[PDB]
Amino acid sequence: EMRILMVGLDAAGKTTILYKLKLGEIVTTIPTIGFNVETVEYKNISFTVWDVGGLDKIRPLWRHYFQNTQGLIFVVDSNDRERVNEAREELMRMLAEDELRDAVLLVFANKQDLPNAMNAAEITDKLGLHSLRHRNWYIQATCATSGDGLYEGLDWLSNQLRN
Amino acid sequence: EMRILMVGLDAAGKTTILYKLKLGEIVTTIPTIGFNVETVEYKNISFTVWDVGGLDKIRPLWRHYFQNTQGLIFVVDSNDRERVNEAREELMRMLAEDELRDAVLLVFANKQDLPNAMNAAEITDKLGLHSLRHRNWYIQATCATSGDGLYEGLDWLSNQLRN
Amino acid sequence: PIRLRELIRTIRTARTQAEEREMIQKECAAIRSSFREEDNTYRCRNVAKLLYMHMLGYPAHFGQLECLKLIASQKFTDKRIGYLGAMLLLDERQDVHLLMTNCIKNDLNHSTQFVQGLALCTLGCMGSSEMCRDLAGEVEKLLKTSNSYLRKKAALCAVHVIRKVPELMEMFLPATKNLLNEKNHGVLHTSVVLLTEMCERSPDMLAHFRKLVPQLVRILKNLIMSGYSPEHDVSGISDPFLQVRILRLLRILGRNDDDSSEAMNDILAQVATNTETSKNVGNAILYETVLTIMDIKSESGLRVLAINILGRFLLNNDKNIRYVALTSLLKTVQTDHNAVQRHRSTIVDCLKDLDVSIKRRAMELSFALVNGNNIRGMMKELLYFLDSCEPEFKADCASGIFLAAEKYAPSKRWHIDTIMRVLTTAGSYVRDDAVPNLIQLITNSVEMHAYTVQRLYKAILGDYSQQPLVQVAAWCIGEYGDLLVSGQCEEEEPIQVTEDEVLDILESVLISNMSTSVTRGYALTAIMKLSTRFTCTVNRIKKVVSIYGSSIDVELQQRAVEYNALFKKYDHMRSALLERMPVME
Amino acid sequence: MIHFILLFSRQGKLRLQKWYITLPDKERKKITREIVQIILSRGHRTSSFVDWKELKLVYKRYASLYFCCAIENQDNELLTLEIVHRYVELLDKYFGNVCELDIIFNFEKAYFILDEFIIGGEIQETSKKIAVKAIEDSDMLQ
Amino acid sequence: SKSSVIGWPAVRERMRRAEPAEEVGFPVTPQVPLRPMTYKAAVDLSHFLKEKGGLEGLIHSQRRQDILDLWIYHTQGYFPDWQNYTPGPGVRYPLTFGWCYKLVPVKGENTSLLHPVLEWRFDSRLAFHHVARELHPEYFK
Numbered sequence A, B: 001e002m003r004i005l006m007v008g009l010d011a012a013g014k015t016t017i018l019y020k021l022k023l024g025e026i027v028t029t030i031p032t033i034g035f036n037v038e039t040v041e042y043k044n045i046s047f048t049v050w051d052v053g054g055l056d057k058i059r060p061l062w063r064h065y066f067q068n069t070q071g072l073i074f075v076v077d078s079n080d081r082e083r084v085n086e087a088r089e090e091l092m093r094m095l096a097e098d099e100l101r102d103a104v105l106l107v108f109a110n111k112q113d114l115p116n117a118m119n120a121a122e123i124t125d126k127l128g129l130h131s132l133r134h135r136n137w138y139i140q141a142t143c144a145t146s147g148d149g150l151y152e153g154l155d156w157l158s159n160q161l162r163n
Numbered sequence C: 001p002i003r004l005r006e007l008i009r010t011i012r013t014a015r016t017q018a019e020e021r022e023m024i025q026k027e028c029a030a031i032r033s034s035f036r037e038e039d040n041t042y043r044c045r046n047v048a049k050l051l052y053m054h055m056l057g058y059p060a061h062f063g064q065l066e067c068l069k070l071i072a073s074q075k076f077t078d079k080r081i082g083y084l085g086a087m088l089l090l091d092e093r094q095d096v097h098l099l100m101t102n103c104i105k106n107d108l109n110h111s112t113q114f115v116q117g118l119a120l121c122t123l124g125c126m127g128s129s130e131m132c133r134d135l136a137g138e139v140e141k142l143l144k145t146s147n148s149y150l151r152k153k154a155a156l157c158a159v160h161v162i163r164k165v166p167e168l169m170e171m172f173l174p175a176t177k178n179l180l181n182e183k184n185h186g187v188l189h190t191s192v193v194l195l196t197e198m199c200e201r202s203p204d205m206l207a208h209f210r211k212l213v214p215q216l217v218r219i220l221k222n223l224i225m226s227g228y229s230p231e232h233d234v235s236g237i238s239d240p241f242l243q244v245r246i247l248r249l250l251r252i253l254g255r256n257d258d259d260s261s262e263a264m265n266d267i268l269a270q271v272a273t274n275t276e277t278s279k280n281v282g283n284a285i286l287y288e289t290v291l292t293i294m295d296i297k298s299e300s301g302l303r304v305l306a307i308n309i310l311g312r313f314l315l316n317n318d319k320n321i322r323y324v325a326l327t328s329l330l331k332t333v334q335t336d337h338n339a340v341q342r343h344r345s346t347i348v349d350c351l352k353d354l355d356v357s358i359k360r361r362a363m364e365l366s367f368a369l370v371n372g373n374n375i376r377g378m379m380k381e382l383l384y385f386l387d388s389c390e391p392e393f394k395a396d397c398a399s400g401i402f403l404a405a406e407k408y409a410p411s412k413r414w415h416i417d418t419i420m421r422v423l424t425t426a427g428s429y430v431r432d433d434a435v436p437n438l439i440q441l442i443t444n445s446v447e448m449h450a451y452t453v454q455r456l457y458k459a460i461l462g463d464y465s466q467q468p469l470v471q472v473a474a475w476c477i478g479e480y481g482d483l484l485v486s487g488q489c490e491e492e493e494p495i496q497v498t499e500d501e502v503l504d505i506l507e508s509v510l511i512s513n514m515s516t517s518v519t520r521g522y523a524l525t526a527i528m529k530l531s532t533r534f535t536c537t538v539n540r541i542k543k544v545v546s547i548y549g550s551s552i553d554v555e556l557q558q559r560a561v562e563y564n565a566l567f568k569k570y571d572h573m574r575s576a577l578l579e580r581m582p583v584m585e
Numbered sequence D: 001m002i003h004f005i006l007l008f009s010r011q012g013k014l015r016l017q018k019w020y021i022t023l024p025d026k027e028r029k030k031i032t033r034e035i036v037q038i039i040l041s042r043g044h045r046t047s048s049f050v051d052w053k054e055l056k057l058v059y060k061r062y063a064s065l066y067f068c069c070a071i072e073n074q075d076n077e078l079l080t081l082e083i084v085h086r087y088v089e090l091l092d093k094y095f096g097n098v099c100e101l102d103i104i105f106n107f108e109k110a111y112f113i114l115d116e117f118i119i120g121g122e123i124q125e126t127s128k129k130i131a132v133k134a135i136e137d138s139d140m141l142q
Numbered sequence E: 001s002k003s004s005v006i007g008w009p010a011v012r013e014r015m016r017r018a019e020p021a022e023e024v025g026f027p028v029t030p031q032v033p034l035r036p037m038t039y040k041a042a043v044d045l046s047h048f049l050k051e052k053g054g055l056e057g058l059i060h061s062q063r064r065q066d067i068l069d070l071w072i073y074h075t076q077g078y079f080p081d082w083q084n085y086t087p088g089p090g091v092r093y094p095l096t097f098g099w100c101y102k103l104v105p106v107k108g109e110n111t112s113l114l115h116p117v118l119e120w121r122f123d124s125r126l127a128f129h130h131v132a133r134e135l136h137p138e139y140f141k
Ligand SMILES: Nc1nc2c(ncn2[C@@H]2O[C@H](COP(=O)(O)OP(=O)(O)OP(=O)(O)O)[C@@H](O)[C@H]2O)c(=O)[nH]1
Pocket: A009, A010, A011, A012, A013, A014, A015, A016, A017, A028, A029, A030, A031, A032, A033, A052, A053, A054, A055, A110, A111, A112, A113, A142, A143, A144, A145, A146
């Protein structure tokens, strides 16, 4: 059992990830206004995953799911150099809360498809993940439309449940 | 104390592993119809290791040692692409039992001698280790005839002894 | 955990077996629970207490894996326990015993000969056919050793793998070459039993092995002439166990050879005279000596002497020797056939002996003694002895009457007369299997069925409950009914055949509960034939077929309805297939 | 070939079975029950042999304990009784004043004595000295 | 001496399997009154040993005594010091006033391969004429 949240910007593939983790296929997904949950069942831990869409009118309501959260997924796009700043703003906005203080971080460099897509390292330092405090943050470069690195992030995450 | 089982296909070097962890040398070993046991003492844990040969006429009898097992080693051959299907069949047949439900899995990628020999990653995805349930599986690429990776698998195994 | 003898002492205090089972399952759980603890300490004794319960007859399937742990132990006592219960709890069909194969193979290479002695013990006692296939090169390797502690063991283990795997002895033909000069007798004994085994299986091995016949003729003569040793000597007779095995090897060799039969002739003439017949041992020496002489193309002076040996053995009051002497002539029935026939009254005497086996050997040898000369007189003893059999011998005699009568019957009538006598007096004792044989020989008989069927009819009015009797009769009434009721289509002067009580006596079987339903199977068969074999009163028998179409036996419900349509629709096609059956052998 | 060996009490209480032939336990419990019944239903002048179902079944009483073998129907019989008696001698050898209650107790070595004497259903040591010597050495090995 | 009948062959077997030539402490049976082996009960016992039989002329020893005496204490409730006899020099007379038996001097596979003591006597005047008191006057006052 683990409460999982999939936060991030819009068009992040986060529902593309979620139905790849639960089902295994890339379903044609609308821009999800509300949220999503599928209990992904993997590595002796049932990951209860609260995927929530990342459009503008939703981001204030993000605080309502930050309770009993054992772990984050802050999905980033590797193909959004223009939005990495507000994502870095979002991250520094969101992590700084007393609620959601003991949940580790697993960042997905989604949409590794282009030379526009960066690696984990540049995305780490554009976000400044070394500036974090009280964090088991761990970026994990993933390809949602091919399942690549997805189970490996879940692998790292399942290590990070027990102590 | 830890009861260890060495299940897997024939000619896997499983007795070669067993007399390299215990003795430290590669003894000339017959194809073992029955079994072997050598209490390997490593990471100050006495690994009582039940090496059982992997021929056709023995594989049904494997169910008899599946009681009070705290740890598996499923050695595969990296030099057997043709046998990885039945090794995948053997694994799914075996792991699906109520007896032997709480024992961790440590897959050895033995016989790393060739470009024929694969790494841990292709052997992970041929066997389909990401399809697993209630498992602390962890593949460990090992070289039986040189001692390489063997005790490091035994290193990780003694971590998964206690919780 | 308590000890073995502490448990046994508690078991010896048990009164009721049900109460004893309470004491079983008391300790058995602790044995199980210790097995859940994976103990190595008391695993010696918990298995030992378990094997006692196994000897006490209790389900000890669970501890068999711990026996494999005790074989795969390192302490000698745990092995000493471990090899034992492997011979006890495991067999070939135990199917979990295959894990011994690695463990034995390591322990055939153990430093201690006693550990290897345990490994040769367990494989020699209960080694499986595939375990024999998986250990064959190691046993001959331990047969190529010099350790006579192991050479005595690897030889008999090689017998076992040749016993279990008959197609494996050819790799032991080189193994056995020229170890016949062993100073030890025990290894030399096991080699003889191996050469007994090697000569037994393949005739192709006989050519290599009849060569060394005079080698052991010397060594057996060495055993007679070494009249004492402090070991091997029982009652002043030196190593009689080896001596018989040589004779048995000399029995299977030279049995169709003559030169080896003459190469062994001297020591046969020796020990037939140079034996001490006082104790049981020298009789056991001389018994195989008789059997060795009979089976080889021997000297005629041996065999005449040998019957004179047996004439002594017929007259010893030891029932052992009487069992020995009766078995002896039971062996050499055909060989020296008429020197047996002069001991005939001794055999008829042992019919009146008060032992089962003595009466068993005498009755069967009397079945063997019947030639075409004693056929008339001895059967009158035997038909009397058939009356004076035990009910266990009544089944045994009445068949063995039928066996020798089919051989050497001087008449066909008297052949019928004795069989008809036995069928009246055996009844529930004569086997149903001889009934198609008796049915065959009386239709092999072609001439006396008016003689037969009347005498068949004259006794079945006495009784029906003798089921193999009335098995015989109903086929005869169906087939040779014309010879029973003859020219009596209508009523005539009253002869004993009356063609209605003829039909009533079969009908009496059909309602009688003492009918094996193949009595009733033969009876409707006889009813339907006497629709053709009798022209007197048919279609009253159609009524009996028609009322039987609702019967509760399945085939006898089939049999009646399948008859009845011929009785109702194809009355002319009834007789169109009721020709008599052909006669075969 | 000795097919099996049975040692059962005056009450028929079996103190030893040794199946040199592989037949299952129900058949073991059937056959053993019958022959004990056969021998105990058999008198003292009944020739010490039973022709039991193609087995010239050898019995030889020595004490309250009874004795049983199943030899192949081509072999010797009095020697087969002597095999029992040689084994009786070896039990008389290794124990001395060989007696009933440690048959109940120390049966484990009586199997081992049989293991030093008969493996496979046949004799391995025709001496009576060398066999009990070897079991003492393995006892001296402990 | 009723419950002394059910172990009359059973404990005597353990006596006879004891050679005439874990655990710590001593339990006491709860709420059962205890008393020494009294005179008339020893008269009740010496006749119980006279009538039930299997005791007279048996090889007496100390190991058999201690098997017997504790069994009396645990099944009948009597202090197991009553089967005391006079020592080595002389006839082993009972110190017990009422015990009419004086002691005069007189499996099989536990033997190795090649090999490299008292008895009772009934004396009915031991209950009255204490002969052990004649052998030990200064101890009995
Ligand atoms: N090429 C490529 N495109 C991807 C990959 N992952 C996601 N995408 C694209 O990103 C788009 C957004 O994915 P969705 O999951 O459907 O939408 P979302 O990110 O969940 O946004 P919301 O629905 O508003 O929560 C998809 O339509 C995909 O085409 C990837 O790994 N490779």
